Motif scaffolding. Structure first.
Motif, short mmCIF file in Angstrom:
data_model
loop_
_atom_site.label_atom_id
_atom_site.label_comp_id
_atom_site.label_asym_id
_atom_site.label_seq_id
_atom_site.Cartn_x
_atom_site.Cartn_y
_atom_site.Cartn_z
N UNK B 35 0.83 -1.20 0.00
CA UNK B 35 0.00 0.00 0.00
C UNK B 35 0.87 1.25 0.00
N UNK B 36 0.28 2.36 -0.44
CA UNK B 36 1.03 3.58 -0.67
C UNK B 36 1.47 4.22 0.65
N UNK B 37 2.30 5.26 0.52
CA UNK B 37 2.96 5.87 1.68
C UNK B 37 1.96 6.56 2.59
N UNK B 38 1.07 7.38 2.02
CA UNK B 38 0.22 8.25 2.81
C UNK B 38 -1.24 7.83 2.83
N UNK D 19 10.67 16.58 1.97
CA UNK D 19 9.40 15.91 2.13
C UNK D 19 8.54 16.64 3.15
N UNK D 217 3.22 -3.47 7.05
CA UNK D 217 3.61 -3.31 5.66
C UNK D 217 4.42 -4.52 5.23
N UNK D 223 10.83 6.03 0.80
CA UNK D 223 9.81 7.05 0.71
C UNK D 223 8.84 7.05 1.88
N UNK D 224 8.85 5.99 2.67
CA UNK D 224 7.90 5.88 3.78
C UNK D 224 8.42 6.59 5.01
N UNK D 227 7.84 10.34 5.37
CA UNK D 227 6.53 10.74 5.86
C UNK D 227 6.44 10.60 7.37
#
Ligand SMILES: Nc1nc2c(ncn2[C@@H]2O[C@H](COP(=O)(O)OP(=O)(O)OP(=O)(O)O)[C@@H](O)[C@H]2O)c(=O)[nH]1
Ligand SMILES: Nc1nc2c(ncn2[C@@H]2O[C@H](COP(=O)(O)OP(=O)(O)O)[C@@H](O)[C@H]2O)c(=O)[nH]1
Ligand SMILES: Nc1nc2c(ncn2[C@@H]2O[C@H](COP(=O)(O)OP(=O)(O)O)[C@@H](O)[C@H]2O)c(=O)[nH]1
Lengths: 6, 48, 440, 427, 372, 426
Positions: B35-38, D19, D217, D223-224, D227
Motif C-alpha cells: 500500500x502507498x505511503x500516505x 518531504x 507493511x 519514501x515511507x 513521511x
C-alpha cells in the motif's frame, strides 16, 4: 597500414 | 564432445531437440508492491 | 559534470578495453558510429553520458579513451574494424615495437619516446573537462608492455595532477597457469615505482573466470570474447552511480577514504552474483536475500584464493536493478549471523551498500539471460595475502642464479632494482599479517 | 512577528526536509505553482511563519538548499514542489563530499561559508522577530555531520538569544552504510551539545519496525520514513501557527524541558498509527490514543523503557477533545508507572491541546519523550571510537586533510561528559 | 520502456510569457517527466502520476499535471508520430434539424464505436457559409425539402477522431437511402435513425479528401460562423446545463436519454470555453456564496464542456430539483430518480452544473453564446 | 560603391590570382559562364566591388592580367575559369624576362606599361569610387619584380591618395629556386618602402609545412597551396563586402597597425585549419580559432614570431558570434604573453565582425600583423647579397641592359636602415 594509414 | 563451437553451452540430448522458449522473458520473482505511503497515514474526508 | 578519464595500455588492457565500449554504447542509445538513431529523440534535460562521452557540436558523441600501445597489431585491429568511427583518430597513438617483456624497454628505451606525447592527450581532455573525478587505466601486471609502460603513465600524473584518485584495473599474474617466463620477474617491478603514486589498484585473476564458466554457466572451453565481457559488467557498475541517479550514490572521492584504511592496504577483489544462463534462471528464483549469500560463495569469486581462510575486512555490496532497501538489511544481518564468514574484529561495522534504479543489461549474442538484479561486491579481504606468498616464491628461484637478467641489462637496466624490490614485497606481506592478528 | 529560518544540508535531511514542504503545503493549501489552493480560511493568516510572499500574492518558502555536491539539489528540485524555492539561494559546490571533516570544514567548507551565511541573512534581516532555526541534518558523514555543525557554530556569535532546533538521524544499532563515522560524529557532538539549544534524534532501525508490527507493511521503501518523520516535526510546530486552548512557542520549550544545560536530545513520536485491515476494529478516543502514545513499540528509538525513567514527556494533542480527558489520562498513566518516572519531579508530564486536526484523521497527537534510557545509544557510538583510534585506523585521511590526533581524544572526552554529567542525575 | 514525448505550452501568470517544455510519458509504468527545450537544464524531475491516460495522450486535449494546465502542441518524435498520428484520423458529422430530439441513442452508438468527440456545437451559419454547403451538390433529384431544412432548421457540427474514422463511420452508417436501408434491415444509424432519406440525418463524408471540403463547408474559420443558434429568451430562459468531465467519462449519451425522458426538450449545445476567464465570468454569482470553490472551478479547468441552454417545460417537477441536491450521496439518500444518483460523480462537483437563482439564466445564456 | 582594382604580373602571380578569382566566384555565387546562380540575396548586394555589369546580367571582373611572354595567359584562359576573365585584359609580350630585373624594369617590361596604363586608367575611372589597389606578384621572377614594381611606382605617381597593398611572394631563406634571388628580391625591396603601405610577405617553405602537418595531404600541389593564399585575400575584405556587428575597411587596418611611415611590413595568417579526414571531431567554436592563429605553426611567412615583439596585431572575424567571448580571449593573449608585445603602446589588438560565414564554414577569421621578427625574412637576403657583390658574381647581366652599380649600392643602404629601425624596439 603503413605510414599515414588512416 | 563439448565442441558445438568453441564458446557454447553443452545441451543434453533431450533438451537439444525440444522447445526453447526460455531466453526471452525475465527471471527473478518481483518486488512486491505494498500500500502507498500516505494512504494509511492520511485519508480523504467528506462532510455528509 | 561528473566525468572520468580512461586510458588503455598493452594488449591485455586494450582488448578488454574493446569490450568496455560495447557495453557503454548499449546502455544509452548511441549507435556505434557515434550518431544517435534520430528516429527517437531524447529530451534536453538529461546529462547522463558525460561520465564517459563528450558530444561534439553537431550530433556525434565522442568517448574518453586514449588507446595507446607501442604495437600496431591491436590498435589497427580496431582502427579498421567496426568501431573505428567512434574514437578520435589522434587519440589512437601507436609506435614501432612491443616492449617484449623488457622493463628496460617500456620504461627506458622505447617507452620514453612517445611518453612526451601520450601525456599531451591526458592533458588535453582534462583541460576541456572541469569536474574530473578519477582515472580508469586498464593494464596487466604480467608483461613488460602492460606493466612496464603503465608505471611511466602512473608517475607522470602524480607529479602533474596529484589529488585525483587513480583507479586502474588489471589481470593478476596467476598461481596455476601462465603464458610467459619473466612474469615473476616483472610483477615485482611495477610495485616499487607505483606504490608511492597510486591510490587504488584493483586486480582480477583470469583462470577463475574459466571455471565460473563451467559451473555457473555451462561454457566449456571459454575464449576471450567471454572473459572480457565479465570484466565489462563489473567496471560499468562501479561507474554507474556517477551517470545514473539512485538511492545511495557514492562519488569516486569516497572510494579512497572509506576503502583504504592504512596507506599500504588498497588492493581489493571483485565479484558479480547472477552469472546464470537461460536454462537455469528459468528454473531458479533470484530474490535479494539469496543473491547476497551467493556473493560469499567460493564458487563465485573472480580470483582463486580461499575466502574461508580470509577474514573479510570491508565489504561494499553495490547493487543495481529492481531492489528495495529493506531487503538488504534483511540480507546483511543474515550474512553476519553466519559462522563461516569471518570478519575483522577491530573494525566495528565493515559494511557499505549502494542501491540504484538502473537494471543490469546484456550485450546481445552473449550467454547471459535477463536478470532483474545484479550485485557487484568489492571484497577487501585478508584472503589474498597468501597469494603474495607464491609469486615472491616464483621470483627468487631463477634469482638464485640470475636467469634472464642479461636481456634486461642490454637496454639500460641494472640488476640493483631486483634486490631492492624483493624486500618491498616482503614489507607488503608483514602488514597483511598484522591486520588479521587481533589486538587483545 | 513569529518565524523560523530554514536550511537543508546533508543528503539524508535534504530528502526528508523537502518531504516537509508537501506535508506543510497541503495542510495550508498551496499549489505547487505557488497559488493558494486551500479549502478553509483559517490556515492562511499564519502563513508568515514558514513562508515569505512574492509579488502577485503567490507564496514562496523560507528554506536554504546547500550541500557539497550538486547531485541532490537535482533531487530536491523534483516533481512535487520544486518550483517554489528561490533560484538565487540555491547553492551548489564543486569538490567531492568525501566524508572528511576537513572536507566538512577546512577544505571545502571554507569557500561556501561566506556565501552560505548570506543566505541566512537575506531571509532574516528582512524580518521582525526570529524564533527558530530548523536544519535537517544527520550524524554519519562529513557531508551532513560536518555541515550541520558548520552552519550553526557560525551563527551563535551573532544570533545568540534565539533557539536553534535541528532534526538529526542517529546511527542504527545493527549496520551503518558509512564506515568512517565517529571521527566526525564525535567531533560534531563537541559543538551540537554546546551551541544548539534543542537537537533531536531518529533511529533508522526503529523506523522500519513500526512498519512491520503496527502498519503490517510488506515493503518499506525510503519514501515511507520521510513521511513518518515529516509528520512529527509538522505537529510540534503548530501552536505557533494555529488557534488553540493551551499554546506554547519554541521558547516555552526552552524552560519547560531542559533542567541542566547540556541535556536536550528528545525522542519523537506520533500516536494514531494503524494498518488497513484493522481500522474498523479500532476506536478513537483520548484514552485509546494515550496507550499508543505510551506504547513501548511506537517510539522512533530502539531503547527499552526499563532503563528509562522519563524526565519530561510532552504529548502535544491536536484535535477536538476534552481538556479533563487529557489531564486525567496524562496522570492515570503515571501512578501506574512509579519507578519509571523520577521522584525528584512531582509533575513529570505536560500537554498542549490545539484546534486543527491533521488532514485525514479527526484527531492525532505527537509524543515527545525525554528518557534515562538513551544512554544505550550513548554507549554504542562512544565504544566504536576506542578500538578504531588506537589503530589510527582511518586517521590517515583526516591527518592528510588536517585533523590532529590530540583532538580525537578531546572529542571523546567531551562525549564522555554526555554520560558523566548524565549519570549524576540518573540516580 | 517505450516513452512517448510531446511539446507542452504553459502561460506563466506573473511574468506573462508563453513557456515551452518537453513532457515525457511512460506507458506501462505511469511515469511522467518534464525537461525544458528553451533552457536545457532539468527543472521538473521524474515522477509517477496516476490520473493521465493514453486516451488523454492526444494532440490538443488539454490535461492538467500537478495543477498546471497545458495543451500538447507538437510531435517532437517520429516514433510517436508513427505510433499514433498515422491511425488517428478525423471525421466530420452534423446533427440536422430532425435529430435533436433523437440524439441520445446516436451519441451512445458513437461512444460505443469509440470515437473521441473534439467539438460538437450547435450553429446557425450565415448566407455565404450556408450556400457553400450546397454549392458542391448537384444531381438529378430535387432537394428543396433538404435545402429548406438546412436553411431553416438548426444544426450542430461535430468532429470525431478515431482509428480509421472514415471507415468506421461508413460501417456504422451503412446504406444511404432510408427505404433502402430499412429494406436491407441491418442495425445502422441510417436504418434506425433519420427521416425520409435525404431530408435529414447525421452527416457523413464520402471520402477522406472530401471530408476537408465538407468540414470547411459546415464549420469554417470563424469569420462569419454565427455565435448563436437558439432564441435568447422564451420567458423561461432559466436552465443551464454543462458537462466538463462526464463527456470524457462517456455518459453523455445516457444522460441525453434521461433528459429526453419525462418530456424535456434540449435547445442548444456547444463546446468552446476558455478554462478560467469564461467560467469565472459566469461563476461570479457563485463566487461569494459557494464553498469548495477551488474544486468547483478545478473540475471545469479539467476539460471542455458541452454546455446547453434549456427552458422550463412542466411545472410539476422543477428542473433544479430534477437536477437534484448538491451532493450525490444526499441524492442517493433521498431518491434514486435524482440525476446525481443516476450520474453525479463528485462530492459537490456534480455531473450537471446548473444555476440556482432562476433570474440569471437568461443573462448566463446570452453570455454563453450571444456574447460568446 | 568602393570597388577594388586588382593587379597581376608574372607567371607566379597569375596562378595565384587565378585561384583568388575563384573563391570570389564561390562566395558571390558566380558560375564559370559569367551569370549568377546563387540562392541568397545578400550575395547580390555589393556585387560591384569585383564584378562589373554588362548585358544579359553578365558579371565580369575588374581584372588586370599581365606578362611579358604569351606562354602563361594561354593557360589562364585554358583553366576552369576561361569565360570570366576579360579578353581585352590580357596584356602580353613576346620574350620572357628570364630571372632579371632590368628586362622588365628598364627595357622590355618598360615599353609595355603604356598599354597596361591605358587599360587601368580607362578602367579605374569607370569605378564610381575606388577604395584602392592590391597586387600579387613575384619578387622571385623577372616580370613581377621587374615590370610590376613600375606599376606600383607609376600608378602611385598618378593618384597618391589611395592605398597600396601587396600579396608579396617573397623567397624562402633556406631552399632557393634561382641563383639571382639576392638581386631581384634585393632590388625590389628598395622601392617598396617609399611606395607601398601594406606588405604581406608569403613563403612557400612556410606553406609546405601547413598543407602537410595541418591539412594532412601527402601530395600537395601549388593549386592546394594557392587556395590558402587565396583564402586570406578574400579573408581581408570580409566586412566591407557584407553587413555585421563592426565593419572595417582597408583604411581602418592601415591606421590601427602602422605607427610609422616605414614600419609597415605585415605578417599574414588564417585561423581555422584542420585535416580533411578528421573535420567532424573538432568543435568549431570561438576558443578553437584563437588558439591556432596565436601560434608559430599557423603563419604564412617563414619567420618565428617568438624572437621579437609584435608592435601591432590586427584581426577580422566572420559569422554569428558573441562579442564578449572574443573580448575575453583578446585580453588573455595580451595579459598572459605580455613579453611578446612592446610596452609602449596601450592597445595592440583590433577586431572586426562580419555576419555570413563562408560556404561550408560557421566561424572564420584572418590574421594580419605587424611584427619586428620579419628581420629574419630580410637579413638572410641582405647577407646573401654582399657575399656575391664582393665577388661581382653576376654584374655583367645587369650592366649590359641599362643599370649601374650605384643603383645596386644604394639598394642595401635602404635594406640595412630598414632593419636599423626595427632593431631598437624589440
Ligand atoms: N584479460 C585478457 N588478458 C589477456 C588477453 N590476451 C592476453 N592476456 C594476458 O596478458 C598477459 C601478457 O601481458 P601483456 O603485457 O599485455 O602482453 P604484451 O607485452 O602487452 O604483448 P604486446 O601487446 O605485444 O606488447 C598474458 O599472460 C595473458 O594472460 C586478453 O585478450 N584478455
Ligand atoms: N528519507 C530518506 N532517507 C534517506 C534516503 N537516502 C538515504 N537516506 C538516509 O541517509 C543515510 C545515509 O547516511 P548520511 O548521513 O546521509 O551520509 P551523508 O549524506 O554522507 O551525510 C542512510 O542511512 C539513510 O537512512 C532517501 O532517499 N530518503
Ligand atoms: N605556392 C606557389 N608558389 C608559386 C606559384 N607560382 C610561382 N610560385 C613561386 O614563384 C617562383 C618563380 O617565379 P617566376 O616564375 O620566376 O616569376 P615570373 O618570371 O615573374 O613569372 C618560384 O620560386 C615558385 O616557388 C604558385 O602558384 N603557388
Amino acid at each position: 597500414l603503413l605510414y599515414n594509414w588512416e | 564432445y563439448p565442441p558445438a563451437g568453441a564458446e557454447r553451452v553443452f545441451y543434453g540430448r533431450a533438451n537439444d531437440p525440444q522447445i526453447a522458449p526460455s531466453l526471452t522473458h525475465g527471471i527473478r520473482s518481483k518486488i512486491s508492491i505494498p500500500a502507498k505511503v500516505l494512504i494509511n497515514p492520511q485519508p480523504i474526508t467528506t462532510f455528509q | 559534470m561528473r566525468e572520468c578519464i580512461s586510458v588503455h595500455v598493452g594488449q591485455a588492457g586494450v582488448q578488454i578495453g574493446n569490450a568496455c565500449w560495447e557495453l557503454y554504447c548499449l546502455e544509452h542509445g548511441i549507435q556505434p558510429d557515434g550518431q544517435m538513431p534520430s528516429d527517437k529523440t531524447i529530451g534536453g534535460g538529461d546529462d547522463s553520458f558525460n561520465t564517459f562521452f563528450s558530444e561534439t557540436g553537431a550530433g556525434k558523441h565522442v568517448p574518453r579513451a586514449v588507446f595507446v600501445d607501442l604495437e600496431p597489431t591491436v590498435i589497427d585491429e580496431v582502427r579498421t574494424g567496426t568501431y573505428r568511427q567512434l574514437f578520435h583518430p589522434e587519440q589512437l597513438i601507436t609506435g614501432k615495437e612491443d616492449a617484449a617483456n623488457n622493463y628496460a624497454r617500456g620504461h627506458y628505451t622505447i617507452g620514453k619516446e612517445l611518453i612526451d606525447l601520450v601525456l599531451d592527450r591526458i592533458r588535453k581532455l582534462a583541460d576541456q573537462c572541469t569536474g574530473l573525478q578519477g582515472f580508469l587505466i586498464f593494464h596487466s601486471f604480467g608483461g613488460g608492455t602492460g606493466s612496464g609502460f603503465t608505471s611511466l603513465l602512473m608517475e607522470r600524473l602524480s607529479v602533474d595532477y596529484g589529488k585525483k584518485s587513480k583507479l586502474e584495473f588489471s589481470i593478476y599474474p596467476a598461481p596455476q597457469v601462465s603464458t610467459a617466463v619473466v612474469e615473476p620477474y616483472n610483477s615485482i617491478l611495477t610495485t616499487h615505482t607505483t606504490l608511492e603514486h597510486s591510490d587504488c589498484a584493483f586486480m582480477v585473476d583470469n583462470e577463475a573466470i574459466y571455471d565460473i564458466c563451467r559451473r555457473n554457466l555451462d561454457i566449456e572451453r571459454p575464449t576471450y570474447t567471454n572473459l572480457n565481457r565479465l570484466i565489462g559488467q563489473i567496471v560499468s557498475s562501479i561507474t554507474a552511480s556517477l551517470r545514473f541517479d539512485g538511492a545511495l550514490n557514492v562519488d569516486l572521492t569516497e572510494f579512497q577514504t572509506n576503502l583504504v584504511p592504512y596507506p599500504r592496504i588498497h588492493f581489493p577483489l571483485a565479484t558479480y552474483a547472477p552469472v546464470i544462463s537461460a536454462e537455469k534462471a528459468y528454473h531458479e528464483q533470484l530474490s535479494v536475500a539469496e543473491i547476497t549469500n551467493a556473493c560469499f560463495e567460493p564458487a563465485n569469486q573472480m580470483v582463486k584464493c580461499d575466502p574461508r581462510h580470509g577474514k573479510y575486512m570491508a565489504c561494499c555490496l553495490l547493487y543495481r536493478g529492481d531492489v528495495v532497501p529493506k531487503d538488504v538489511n534483511a540480507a546483511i544481518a543474515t550474512i553476519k549471523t553466519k559462522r563461516t564468514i569471518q570478519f575483522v574484529d577491530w573494525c566495528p561495522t565493515g559494511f557499505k551498500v549502494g542501491i540504484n534504479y538502473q537494471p543490469p543489461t546484456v550485450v546481445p549474442g552473449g550467454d547471459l539471460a535477463k536478470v532483474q538484479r545484479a550485485v557487484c561486491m568489492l571484497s577487501n579481504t585478508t584472503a589474498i595475502a597468501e597469494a603474495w606468498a607464491r609469486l615472491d616464491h616464483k621470483f627468487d628461484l631463477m634469482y638464485a642464479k640470475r636467469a634472464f637478467v642479461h636481456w634486461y641489462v642490454g637496454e639500460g637496466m641494472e640488476e640493483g632494482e631486483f634486490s631492492e624490490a624483493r624486500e618491498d614485497m616482503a614489507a607488503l606481506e608483514k602488514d597483511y599479517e598484522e591486520v588479521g592478528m587481533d589486538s587483545v | 512577528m513569529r518565524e523560523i529560518v530554514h536550511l537543508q544540508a546533508g543528503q539524508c535531511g535534504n530528502q526528508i526536509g523537502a518531504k516537509f514542504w508537501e506535508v506543510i503545503s497541503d495542510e495550508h493549501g498551496i499549489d505547487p505553482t505557488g497559488t493558494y489552493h486551500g479549502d478553509s480560511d483559517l490556515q492562511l493568516e499564519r502563513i508568515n511563519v514558514y513562508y515569505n510572499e512574492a509579488t502577485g500574492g503567490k507564496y514562496v518558502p523560507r528554506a536554504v538548499l546547500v550541500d557539497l555536491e550538486p547531485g541532490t539539489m537535482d533531487s530536491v528540485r523534483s516533481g512535487p514542489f520544486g518550483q517554489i524555492f528561490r533560484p538565487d539561494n540555491f547553492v551548489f559546490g564543486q569538490s567531492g563530499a568525501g566524508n572528511n571533516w576537513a572536507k566538512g570544514h577546512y577544505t571545502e567548507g571554507a569557500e561556501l561559508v561566506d556565501s552560505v551565511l548570506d543566505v541566512v541573512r537575506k531571509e532574516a534581516e528582512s524580518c521582525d522577530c526570529l524564533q527558530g532555526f530548523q536544519l535537517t541534518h544527520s550524524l554519519g558523514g562529513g557531508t551532513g555531520s560536518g555541515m550541520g555543525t558548520l552552519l550553526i557554530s557560525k551563527i551563535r556569535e551573532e544570533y545568540p538569544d534565539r533557539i536553534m532546533n535541528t532534526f538529526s538521524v542517529v546511527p542504527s544499532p545493527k549496520v551503518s552504510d558509512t564506515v568512517v563515522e565517529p571521527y566526525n560524529a564525535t567531533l560534531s557532538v563537541h559543538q551540537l551539545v554546546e551551541n544548539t539549544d534543542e537537537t533531536y534524534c531518529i533511529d533508522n532501525e526503529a523506523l522500519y519496525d513500526i512498519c512491520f508490527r503496527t502498519l503490517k507493511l510488506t515493503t518499506p521503501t525510503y519514501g515511507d520514513l520521510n513521511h513518518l518523520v515529516s509528520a512529527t516535526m509538522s505537529g510540534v510546530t503548530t501552536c505557533l501557527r494555529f488557534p488553540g486552548q493551551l499554546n506554547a512557542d519554541l521558547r516555552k520549550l526552552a524552560v519547560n524541558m531542559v533542567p541542566f544545560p547540556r541535556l536536550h536530545f528528545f525522542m519523537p513520536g506520533f500516536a494514531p498509527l494503524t494498518s488497513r485491515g484493522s481500522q474498523q476494529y479500532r476506536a478513537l478516543t483520548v484514552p485509546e490514543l494515550t496507550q499508543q502514545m505510551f506504547d513501548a513499540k511506537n517510539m522512533m528509538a530502539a531503547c527499552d523503557p526499563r532503563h528509562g525513567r522519563y524526565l519530561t514527556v510532552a504529548a502535544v494533542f491536536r484535535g477536538r477533545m476534552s481538556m479533563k480527558e487529557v489531564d486525567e489520562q496524562m496522570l492515570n498513566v503515571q501512578n501506574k508507572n512509579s519507578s519509571y518516572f523520577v521522584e525528584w519531579i512531582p509533575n513529570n508530564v505536560k500537554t498542549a491541546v490545539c484546534d486543527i486536526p491533521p488532514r485525514g484523521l479527526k484527531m492525532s497527537a505527537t509524543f515527545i519523550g525525554n528518557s534515562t534510557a538513551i544512554q544505550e545509544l550513548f554507549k554504542r557510538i562512544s565504544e566504536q571510537f576506542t578500538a578504531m583510534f588506537r589503530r589510527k585506523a582511518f586517521l590517515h585521511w583526516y591527518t592528510g586533510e588536517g585533523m590532529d590526533e590530540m583532538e580525537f581524544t578531546e572529542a571523546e572526552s567531551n562525549m564522555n561528559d554526555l554520560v558523566s554529567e548524565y549519570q549524576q542525575y540518573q540516580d | 520502456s517505450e516513452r512517448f514525448v510531446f511539446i507542452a505550452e504553459w502561460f506563466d501568470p506573473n511574468a506573462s510569457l508563453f513557456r515551452r517544455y518537453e513532457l515525457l510519458f511512460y506507458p506501462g509504468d505511469g511515469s511522467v517527466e518534464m525537461h525544458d527545450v528553451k533552457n536545457h537544464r532539468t527543472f521538473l524531475k521524474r515522477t509517477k502520476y496516476e490520473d493521465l491516460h493514453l486516451e488523454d495522450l492526444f494532440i490538443g486535449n488539454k490535461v492538467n499535471i500537478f495543477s498546471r494546465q497545458l495543451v500538447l502542441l507538437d510531435y517532437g518524435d517520429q516514433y510517436t508520430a508513427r505510433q499514433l498520428g498515422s491511425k488517428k484520423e478525423k471525421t466530420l458529422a452534423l446533427i440536422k434539424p430532425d435529430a435533436v430530439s433523437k440524439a441520445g441513442e446516436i451519441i451512445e452508438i458513437i461512444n460505443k464505436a469509440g470515437f473521441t468527440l473534439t467539438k460538437l456545437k450547435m450553429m446557425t451559419l450565415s448566407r455565404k457559409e450556408a450556400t457553400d454547403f450546397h454549392i458542391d451538390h448537384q444531381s438529378r433529384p430535387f432537394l428543396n425539402e433538404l435545402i429548406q431544412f438546412i436553411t431553416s432548421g438548426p444544426i450542430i457540427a461535430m468532429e470525431i477522431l478515431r482509428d480509421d474514422a472514415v471507415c468506421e463511420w461508413k460501417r456504422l452508417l451503412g446504406p444511404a437511402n432510408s427505404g433502402l436501408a430499412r429494406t436491407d434491415a441491418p442495425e445502422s444509424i441510417r436504418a434506425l435513425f433519420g427521416t425520409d432519406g435525404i431530408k435529414n440525418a447525421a452527416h457523413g463524408p464520402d471520402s477522406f479528401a472530401c471530408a476537408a471540403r465538407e468540414m470547411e463547408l459546415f464549420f469554417p474559420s470563424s469569420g462569419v460562423c454565427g455565435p448563436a443558434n437558439t432564441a435568447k429568451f422564451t420567458n423561461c430562459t432559466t436552465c443551464c446545463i454543462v458537462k466538463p468531465h462526464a463527456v470524457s467519462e462517456g455518459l453523455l449519451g445516457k444522460i441525453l436519454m434521461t433528459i429526453r425522458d419525462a418530456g424535456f426538450e434540449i435547445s442548444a449545445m456547444q463546446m468552446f470555453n476558455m478554462d478560467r476567464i469564461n467560467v469565472e465570468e459566469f461563476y461570479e454569482v457563485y463566487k461569494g456564496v459557494v464553498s469548495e470553490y477551488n474544486e468547483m472551478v478545478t473540475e471545469m479547468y479539467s476539460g471542455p464542456c458541452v454546455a446547453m441552454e434549456i427552458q422550463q417545460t412542466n411545472p410539476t417537477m422543477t428542473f433544479r430539483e430534477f437536477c437534484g441536491p448538491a451532493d450525490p450521496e444526499i441524492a442517493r439518500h433521498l431518491r434514486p430518480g435524482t440525476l446525481r444518483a443516476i450520474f453525479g460523480k463528485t462530492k459537490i462537483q456534480n455531473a450537471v452544473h446548473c444555476t440556482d437563482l432562476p433570474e440569471d439564466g437568461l443573462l448566463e445564456v446570452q453570455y454563453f453564446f450571444k456574447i460568446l
